[model samples]
Target: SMSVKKPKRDDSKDLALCSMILTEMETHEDAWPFLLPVNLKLVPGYKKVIKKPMDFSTIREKLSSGQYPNLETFALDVRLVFDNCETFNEDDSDIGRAGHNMRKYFEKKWTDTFK
Candidate 1:
């Protein structure tokens, strides 16, 4: 019989990151007339990161099982998710603005979590 190794997931990091994103979205609501809808599938490892708000439960489950190594790597992966948004631009929500705001939010959250 062959055994498959399960990946590790870090829950605290994911929860903290997701919470920051939601808070930032609300804090920066003035900049956005409406919620910014995105197709996570476009992002590499989206299925593993976060698909939707409701998916936090799944994240918690994976994290409890130790699905990731550390928060630093998780932060980098999330940064890539936001950075990648630049590749797909739209007129309504300029990728530049999206990336800038998202980056700001990410930076602050990362600092708060690690500092």
Candidate 2:
């Protein structure tokens, strides 16, 4: 008989979501053609390197070479978030509302999971 591995998270799923969203927000501006006015700015301390445009060819190279591990969820969620960003990202959520929402959702989910 064949069995499937159960989902196991060492950390909070909300934390995972926040981490992913942070990664997405950090990397999105460099990759997207139309940069939306979102509030997920990289920490000023880390801005020097992040200011440059992202080199997607490098990402493609990694994908083609299968160099990334645990990339399935990373790639899937990143694409989906990018696709639906306009919905979650609102002009009203200024002071980085979109970014805050992403982080908040992850935080809420993370906290709720323990209950």
Candidate 3:
């Protein structure tokens, strides 16, 4: 006899929620710097430092390609965008402040949307 065993529960139950969250994130005022990967021509030394650079465009591309396995994985990718900023940025500067503010913006949304 064949047995059926399915061991998966998508509590959120819909992938549309992912797009919605990303949409709001993209519109944030501080999202400008993170819209795309840093331009090496302008900051050639960037690659050597942020070896694992992450950005909203990259995240969107990965998501659109169906590379993200789950919401938690997606969340980690987003957090990396902010973490990368702090590594070479200080809260005293413009981009740095944006990264900190954006991180706070994301955490609050995470709690409200999925937590």
Candidate 4:
């Protein structure tokens, strides 16, 4: 078994809320490219670029495991997924354009929840 560490603050609210939005985003039509981490072998240039890779699966794990220190940490990784996408794909292309919609959808839900 693994040892548990203590935290100064509780994060269940953000944890539950983030999971709700993140899970919903995972079901979107434009979510294909980001469901899993980008394929490095398929796109060799990806390995050289996008130094920090983030994806729905990884974010889900971090969310479930309570590895994130705060909702902002969770938000950081969520936003990074879109940021990394634009770096590799042109905004006019298929995957590139999807990032904006995904981010917009996420932004809307975030405001509705926390605002």
Q: Top model by TM-score, which number?
A: 4
Worst 10 residues of 3 by lDDT: 7-16
Over 1-115, each residue of candidate 2 has an lDDT whose tens digit, in order, gives 2687777755435444444444454464333422332233743432343232222343344444546455354344434443444334454545235444554454454355443
Error of 2 at 72 (Å): 3.9
Better of 2 and 4 by lDDT: 4
In model 2, state the lDDT of residue 112: 53
Go through the candidates in order and give the clash count of each.
6, 0, 0, 0
**Which segments of model 2 are wrong by more than 4 Å?**
1-4, 7-53, 73-115
Better of 2 and 3 by lDDT: 3
Worst 10 residues of 1 by lDDT: 51-60
lDDT by candidate, in order shown: 0.51, 0.42, 0.87, 0.89
Q: What order do you get sorting by lDDT, best first? A: 4, 3, 1, 2
Tell me the TM-score of each prediction against the true structure: 0.44, 0.24, 0.87, 0.87
Best by lDDT: 4
What TM value does model 4 have?
A: 0.87
| Model 1 spans > 4 angstroms off | 1-65, 90-93
As a whole number from 0 to 100, the lDDT of residue 91 in candidate 3 is 81
Show the colliding residue pairs in model 3. none
- lDDT (10s digit) by residue, model 1, range 1-115: 2686677454555655655554564466433422333446665664454433222233334445666466654455455545545444443566557666666876886677656
Q: Give the TM-score (vs. native) of candidate 1.
A: 0.44
